[PDB]
Every structure is written in C-alpha cells, then in structure tokens.
Amino acid sequence: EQLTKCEVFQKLKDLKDYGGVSLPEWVCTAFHTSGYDTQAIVQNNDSTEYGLFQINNKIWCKDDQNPHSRNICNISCDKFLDDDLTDDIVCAKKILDKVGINYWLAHKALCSEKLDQWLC
Amino acid sequence: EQLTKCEVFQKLKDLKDYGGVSLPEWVCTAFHTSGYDTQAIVQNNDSTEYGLFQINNKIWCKDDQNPHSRNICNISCDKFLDDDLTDDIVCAKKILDKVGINYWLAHKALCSEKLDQWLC
Ligand SMILES: [Ca+2]
Ligand SMILES: [Ca+2]
Numbered sequence: 190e191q192l193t194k195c196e197v198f199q200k201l202k203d204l205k206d207y208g209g210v211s212l213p214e215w216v217c218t219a220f221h222t223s224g225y226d227t228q229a230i231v232q233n234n235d236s237t238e239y240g241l242f243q244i245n246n247k248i249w250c251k252d253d254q255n256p257h258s259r260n261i262c263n264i265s266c267d268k269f270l271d272d273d274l275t276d277d278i279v280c281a282k283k284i285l286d287k288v289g290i291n292y293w294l295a296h297k298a299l300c301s302e303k304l305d306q307w308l309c
Numbered sequence: 310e311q312l313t314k315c316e317v318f319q320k321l322k323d324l325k326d327y328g329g330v331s332l333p334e335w336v337c338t339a340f341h342t343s344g345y346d347t348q349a350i351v352q353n354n355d356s357t358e359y360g361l362f363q364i365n366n367k368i369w370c371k372d373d374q375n376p377h378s379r380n381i382c383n384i385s386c387d388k389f390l391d392d393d394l395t396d397d398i399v400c401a402k403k404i405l406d407k408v409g410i411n412y413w414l415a416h417k418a419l420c421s422e423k424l425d426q427w428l429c
Contacts, residue, residue, distance in 0.1 A: 193311075220344060220349075220351075224340065224345060224346065225311075226344065230426075231426070232422070232423040233422050234422050295415060302353050302354050303354065306351070306352050
C-alpha cells in the first residue's frame with residue numbers, strides 16, 4: 190500500500206523521539222527509503238530489503254533466499270510487507286540502537302534541514 | 310499523483326536508452342529520487358527540488374524563491390509538479406547531458422543490480 194505523508198505521520202507516532210530522532214525526521218527517512226510504500230522490495234546481488242524501512246535479510250530478518258541470516262529481529266522478512274507497521278517499528282528501533290540512522294541515510298544532513306516540511 | 314512502478318515504466322518510454330540509460334535504470338532512478346510521486350517537493354536551506362526527477366530551482370528551473378536561478382531548462386519549477394511528464398523529461402535530458410546520472414545517483418551501482426526487478 191502506497192501511503193501518503195500524513196498517513197505515515199500518524200502511523201509512525203510510536204517512534205516519535207525514540208533515540209532522540211523526531212517524528213518529522215522519521216517521515217523524511219521513510220520518504221527517502223521506500224517512498225512510503227509498505228510493500229517495497231529491493232534486491233541486490235547479495236541481499237533483499239523489505240517494506241517501508243527496507244529491512245535486509247542478511248542481518249535483520251529471515252528469508253528463504255537466506256536461512257542463515259543472523260535474524261536479530263527474529264522474524265520472517267515478509268512480515269514487513271503488510272499494512273501493519275507494529276512489527277516494522279519494533280525492528281526499526283533495534284537497527285537504530287545497533288547501527289544508527291546511517292543504516293538508512295548515507296548522510297544525516299539529508300534529513301536535518303527544514304524538518305518542518307515533514308510535519309502533517 | 311503517486312504513480313506505480315508500471316505507470317512510470319510507460320510514462321518514461323521517451324527516455325529509453327537516452328545517454329545509454331536503459332528504461333529499467335530510469336524506473337530505478339525515479340524510485341530512489343521521488344518514490345514515483347509527481348508532486349514531491351523537497352527543501353534544503355539552499356534550494357527546493359521538484360517532482361519525479363527532483364529538479365532544483367538553483368540551476369535548472371526558476372521559482373518565486375530564487376530568481377537568480379541559472380534556469381538552464383528555461384522554465385518555471387511548477388511545471389514539474391503536474392501529471393504531464395513531457396516537460397520534465399526534456400529537462401531530465403539536459404541534466405543527463407550536463408551532469409550525468411550522478412545528479413540522481415551517488416553511485417551508479419545502486420541501479421545496476423537485478424535490473425529486471427524494475428521491469429513491468
Ligand atoms: Ca508489518
Ligand atoms: Ca510536467
């Protein structure tokens with residue numbers, strides 16, 4: 190389901206200020222990551238990334254493509270392709286605590302200027 | 310509107326192989342740039358970027374915010390905010406001639422793996 194900025198804003202409420210990352214910075218990260226598409230799947234030679242947060246199957250969730258995943262989020266990757274963001278959010282917090290915002294942003298400044306434009 | 314993978318595939322047909330860039334490579338580029346949204350507008354402290362190709366008002370188009378724009382594409386940035394992609398494409402060709410795919414991609418590798426995933 191392709192979500193709108195405002196719908197995403199509502200749905201990511203429980204991530205607000207988590208780790209010190211504001212809600213507007215979360216919606217921005219989501220835009221640049223999957224364009225608000227809960228079912229986005231992107232493949233690489235090596236891995237595959239799932240849903241809105243583009244969670245990979247080599248470290249975070251378990252795939253048929255890769256059963257030998259470290260599976261930190263202890264979940265099957267396809268749980269990140271539905272409309273329920275609950276489990277996506279739980280996994281997104283570990284990624285933040287383990288690797289930081291750069292998992293998603295190549296440069297942080299990408300989501301630090303004019304943050305009020307992400308406000309719904 | 311927020312177009313789907315297949316809608317964008319048909320709409321950018323005009324660009325197939327231009328500068329050597331295959332069609333699946335353009336769809337990949339659009340995904341990563343605007344998430345397929347023709348009305349995306351993103352602001353920086355320095356400039357604003359419009360539409361599908363996130364064309365900036367500092368060098369390519371002109372708007373109320375910055376009149377000192379070099380305006381290489383000789384056009385108003387708001388023409389890059391509707392559902393007709395004809396003029397966006399003509400301007401995207403100029404950017405490709407001048408700066409290359411690196412206007413959109415930090416690393417071309419980003420859009421060279423599993424190109425068949427971007428096929429409709
Ligand atoms: Ca889910
Ligand atoms: Ca247009």
